[model samples]
Target chain A: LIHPSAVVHPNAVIGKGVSVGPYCTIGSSVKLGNGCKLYPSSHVFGNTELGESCVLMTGAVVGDELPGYTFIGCNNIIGHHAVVGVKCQDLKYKHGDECFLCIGNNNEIREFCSIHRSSKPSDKTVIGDNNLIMGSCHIAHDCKIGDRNIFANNTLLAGHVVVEDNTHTAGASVVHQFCHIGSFAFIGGGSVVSQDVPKYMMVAGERAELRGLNLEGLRRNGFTMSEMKSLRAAYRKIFMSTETVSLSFEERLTELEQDQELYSVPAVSAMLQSIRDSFTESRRGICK
Target chain B: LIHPSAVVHPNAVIGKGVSVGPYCTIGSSVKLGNGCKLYPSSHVFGNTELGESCVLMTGAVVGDELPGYTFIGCNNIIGHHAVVGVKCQDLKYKHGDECFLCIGNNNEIREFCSIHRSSKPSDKTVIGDNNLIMGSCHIAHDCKIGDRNIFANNTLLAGHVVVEDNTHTAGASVVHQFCHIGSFAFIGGGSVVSQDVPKYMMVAGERAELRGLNLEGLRRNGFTMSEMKSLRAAYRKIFMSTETVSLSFEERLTELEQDQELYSVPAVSAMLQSIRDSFTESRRGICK
Candidate 1:
């Protein structure tokens, strides 16, 4: 069902049942799987493989390099009639030739969500399945997102920002480059997320703080009372037990008990690991 | 006063005193009423019409298409070069397409907005009067926006969404498809709106919670102080009550009987009623 007005390259591979609408521009070496639908006025550039039944709204751009390199994953939506797969946004790659932007399936990319293609080893921005990426959202290069995530409008992830599974980013939330946001993290709108967020947490305000666990989220997602109770205890120790910057780094690491629900949570563990392995550069002065 | 360099189709009807700016493309089926202005780099496509004194800013697109069906009123803006009406967002609609986007008057459309074409039975996406749609907003297919609506920057609306009169969506608010936002409702910045937002309430956070009435908004629109006081009391009763969630929810079910404020302030009653009817799904997450 490809329209005659679509501008598809000769080398592009279009599989069976692929539906391309009017004025769509499919670039070289692009591979669209069976049942992939590119809506009218959409642009698919570079080299990318989109899975079956993928719905690309108007003007969606994909397979370009990312904004910067910070994190990685697969099977995610780039967005409708939006921009994806472009050159790196970093100053170093300003005039460099274009590279690839990768993603996976079942992504509900709304209108105007912009996903930059990957930059080299640093980029490779990836996303898992069933992600609802809203309009005006920007995914920079080299980021990784886990499954079942909902990225709100204007949620801009800088280079190499990693979002684990099921994180709820409110509108206009900005993740600094190379920061790791733990799974199920609720990032407040208009907040500048410079630090690695812990799992099951709610962080809001312009200068964000660890407010509390995602209790409402947990309840709706069928998290048991015992799980919540354990998460709470862990939350208190890490976020509320001490002043935000009062504790020594070594002291904080020794306090993990491995007994609570928070201990087994991958996001919590990822945060800890990121804290341990991250470079000693001061991560201050980050902005949205 | 159309710019000399603009590429308006010969068949497009330009009404009296219309000002079309530079580097614009006005498609054949598009019609501009008296005193409408199209800024530089703008595009008006399909069968969209503009009423008197409308301002279409730079990079705005109007009547590109509805996600399904849509219409707009006049003096209202179609943002700078953003797309409006188109026939389909459906990938399968590569064949002959038949859809329409209609608009009425007195709206201020800001820069960089995208209003897609529709793919519905009526084949129209509609908007009414006095809509102050700000920059970088996306109004997808078939959204019915009522009068006196204010949508701030980066607000994202999916296909078939409905915005009742006097609704105010702050910066970066994301509304899901098919959701109905009632009159005079105030949606906070960065909120993710996945459900019907009722009239007069102040809803904030990721998954927005019903905050009290939109007293500030009402007062700005000439609502009296006495009316605000009543809403404040109800706010305390519903949100700040000593009762738990279940108790507060059960207690507030009889919103109409005890609160004379409902009828006195129509927005308040409508909000309460909608709140009573809404539910949050497991994946439905927002900030508060």
Candidate 2:
């Protein structure tokens, strides 16, 4: 169902039931899966694999490789004017560096969202499944985004940030490079997060610090009352206690280990584990 | 001057000297002012009125009224893929609500910016003259933006926020609903401003509080040294004076009124007046 106006390379493998709309251009070695739809002006290029039923709306550019290989998995919806797999905005990046971008299934990347390819050869920027990346969101090179996360409009994830599963970041938030956002965390709108955000917590502010447990998110996610209680206790003990403001990572880690029995809930343990993981060497320190 | 490929309805009013590019769409009851230029694939629809010398770039959608009437004034530039007069994301808004979006002259709405219409009948989201709303910014329902404001990329303003003249908000800042930002104020990037920011002050932080005088902004705008001195004195007395943190609105107003000498300076007087005006009824309290 490719339109007459569409310019598709002979080497591009267009699967059955795929539709390419007007003015679309598909380049070499790109594989379009069955039931895929490329709307008007959508451009796909390079060595890329687009999974089945993927929909690229008007002007969406996927794997066009501002010079890299990009693999986007199936059932994704790339919204109008959204860009994927373009070269990283990072200045250190060079042409012919052989970087890659890998996105998993079911991401609804909305209007003008930009997901950049990685910089180094053999290094890939990875995104997992079922993420709702909203309008004008910018995911820079080397970021790792896990499943079912919701990034609201204009959420800016700088290079090397690791966003775990089910983390929800509100509009216009900025996550610093190399920062790790643990699972189920809620980052508030306009917050500048430079620190590692532990699991199940909420952070809001310029230079965000821990606000509290993401109680509403937990409740919505069907967290048990007992689990909530355990999480709250652990949250207070680790982040809101008297020593919390000045508590070192080692001190918090010691507390988590010492009171391991109290943090019996899996969610609580996960929070502690993420906090421990935040001790890694990062050029930009975690949001305190 | 419509392109052969442009889809223009007979019922639409095409102004003289208008240039419609290829693949453009103009719907019924839309009025185009003279010298308007629509670049390729630009879409204009609904019962909308566009003013003279306006420019709509590729894929820009103006007056696409997902459900409201949009009236754009003269000499505006809607950048590539920018959307104006779209339906508000506010849940309370209903389809066919008779709300409106009004944009004034000489404005530059950069790529991917979404300015939503108001919620109530006869109500409108108003944007005034000479504003530079940068790329990917989201201006929500009923935001009243005045003249010469520069909103950097990804600046998000929630519903009913009032922004006065010459305000400059940096990239990725978010303003809460119903907050008031007075004239010549500077909001730093990545700030989550929830409070009323006084005129001539600089605010930055997650829950933005007044930081200091917008001296650089004032100087750039050609404010004299005497005016700067007066503004600084008033700012220190009103916001940074004794018991500043605990001071009430009335207390601040009283101090302003008592300083008859300070009010003699027009700029300082304007600051006091804005603060006085903020004490009036508001759904969201002034950012202190």
Candidate 3:
């Protein structure tokens, strides 16, 4: 159901039931899976591949070549006609094609948020399922965001970053490059995140104080109220109370077992374990 | 001094001393004031007016029909033809009918920002003078912004909003439609401002707090350091020390004598007073 005015190259391969709307131009060698729907003015280009049943919203320059001065086709904004444009105001547009920008299915990339192409091979930019990338946000080159994350508007992620599962960006938060954010962490609006964020922590402010656990976030995510209560108490232990989580993975698990107060202590303990594993072996730091 | 390659309509009005540069397209029914300069590959259209001594940088778009379902005009980005377009990514060829996007004199709309025309009233959605709309920001339909303001990178202002003078939006901040931001207030980065923001306060995060006064901003704008200090103390009294500002406003009011050169500060202060007066009269908290 692509619009007739849209400029699709003859050599471009469109999969079965692919729908592209008006004024969008499609390039050659781009592959689309079955039932893919591209909004009007959304361009799909390069060697990028989309899996089945994906819906690309308005003005998405879905795939351009990785950005270097040379090599690979970036966004084909202006041809001979109209104007070549879209998304220079984003963090990812800072370094197009610096690496790969790989996205999963069922994600809603809302208006004006930029997901940069990767520059480094080891640092392929990725996002897990069902994420909401709102307006004016920048997912910088080489960021790896986990499943079901909610990045609010204007979340700026630097290069080589990692966000674990179920995290939320409050708004206008700047996440430093190469930092690891733990699972279920919440960064408040306008917080400048320079260091690794522990899992399940609530971060806010310019310097980004660790407020506490995102207990509200947990409740909103279908977590039981008891589980949220336990998480809140554990948050106080590290944030409100004076206790550091320096114990190793196994040691942290043992500490959780000893503390009978926290019910979702296992989640925290596993999060710490994953952090340790990512730190020692993986490229980036793990969350709390 | 317009470029030869520009696709300018002969019916468009171009004032004396206006400069249009390479490959820019000036559409029919647009009116440019004296000494307004459009850089390479820029575009301006619709029934729009640009005041004297304005500058649109490389690939900037102004006075065009909104790329959206409606048109939002004034200091805005409709589209541009830069070198980055490897293929065409815009489906915004669904550009609707012409509406007004009126801009005042001497404003700086930085690179890659988008301004939509008014969707409702034909004469709505306006920008005042000496405002700095920074890189990658988006101002949606029917928005009205006052003079001498600074909107940072990726700030998104939705429909029917009013940004009073000296209100600064930090990077990635958003002001919802129909909301009014009081003067000299600071919105934190990535903040989603759904409600009204009080004047002369600092607010950040998903839930914005009245942090303090914008003393640094005042000093830079030519207020004496001592006056700024007094303002800071008063600010703390209202936001931190107590909830109601009536007592503090009466006790800590420091009205410096007028300086004609310091016009921006007074104008901002007056706007803040108007917002406060509205709150007092209506007994309703804006943007709560």
Give native contacts recovered, as a fraction, per prediction.
0.14, 0.54, 0.07
Question: Would you estimate the TM-scores of all the predictions?
Answer: 0.63, 0.78, 0.60
Q: Write the per-residue lDDT of candidate 3 for residues A1-288, one digit (tens) a residue.
A: 876667888887787888885556787766667777765455776666666766554345666544421111211111112211222223434444344555665565645566666655445667767676655667776678888787765678987788888898865678887787888888876678876777766777666666766777777778776666676665545434335555434455456556766634676556445445544654444332
In Å, candidate 1's interface RMSD is 6.0
A222-262: candidate 1 lDDT, tens digit per residue: 88877677666655665455565574555655576454556
DockQ of each: 0.16, 0.36, 0.11
C-alpha positional error of residue A141 in candidate 2 after TM-score superposition, expressed in Å: 3.4
Best by DockQ: 2
lDDT of each residue in A179-223, candidate 2, tens digit only: 888888999877788878888889987667778888999998999
Please tell me the TM-score of chain B in candidate 3 relative to the true structure's chain B: 0.69
Candidate with more favorable, higher DockQ: 1 or 2: 2
**Model 2: which residue pairs collide?**
A194-A287, A195-A286, A195-A287, A206-B206, B195-B287, B196-B286, B196-B287
Candidate 2's displacement at residue A98, Å, is: 6.2
Tell me the number of clashing residue pairs for each predicted model.
98, 7, 34
Candidate 3 lDDT score at position B16: 89
Candidate ordering by TM-score (highest first): 2, 1, 3
| Best model number under TM-score | 2
Better of 1 and 2 by TM-score: 2
